[PDB]
């Protein structure tokens, strides 16, 4: 409907809105060999858990995470991870949250272990960006 449209305020659009533009700070500030060594060791020690780096997407105006480096059970679902991150950023239930891994939204029925197997990087970490709508 017309009421659903916006033609009065300017909407700013830029490459900040392209999730493919995301750059994880963790990969800038920590050298590859240190990341790889730590991820390799943690996966050997806890084969039923996956190491995950979570950072906020460029455009997003929602809350920040106090911690970015997580160890997650492989059997945790994407929906459960959404819920747990939502609580950590204090995002009210009424507002949408999105995850992106390698520029795609995860499949609904994926577990964190399935996401890890398909998308982990050569440093043994899985990188997840989170954003608002």
Domain ranges of the chain: 1-133
B/e letters for 26-60, b = 16+ CB within 10 Å, e = fewer, are bbeebeeeebeebbeebbeeeeebbbbbbbbbbbb
Element (H, E) at 53: strand 49-56
Instruction: Determine the Cα–Cα distance for residues 58 and 56; give it in Å rounded to an integer.
Output: 7
Closest CA to 128 of 88, 87, 98: 98
Structure-solving method: X-ray
Q: Resolution in Å, one decimal, please.
A: 1.2
Closest CA to 100 of 17, 16, 13, 19: 19
User: Is residue 78 packed enough to be buried (19+ CB in 10 Å), middle (13-18) or exposed (0-12)?
Assistant: buried
Chain-centroid distance of CA 34 in Å reads 21
């Amino acid at each position: 409907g017309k009421e659903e449209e916006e033609d009065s305020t300017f909407t700013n659009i830029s490459l900040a809105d392209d999730i493919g533009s995301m750059k994880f700070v963790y990969k800038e500030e920590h050298p590859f060999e240190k990341r790889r060594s730590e991820g390799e060791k943690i996966r050997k020690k806890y084969p039923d858990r996956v190491p995950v780096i979570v950072e906020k997407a460029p455009k997003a105006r929602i809350g920040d995470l106090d911690k970015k480096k997580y160890l997650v059970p492989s059997d945790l679902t994407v929906g459960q991870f959404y819920f747990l991150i939502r609580k950590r950023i204090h995002l009210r239930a009424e507002d949408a949250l999105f995850f992106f891994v390698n520029n795609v939204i995860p499949p609904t029925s994926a577990t964190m272990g399935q996401l890890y197997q398909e998308h982990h990087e050569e440093d043994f970490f899985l990188y997840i960006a989170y954003s608002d709508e």
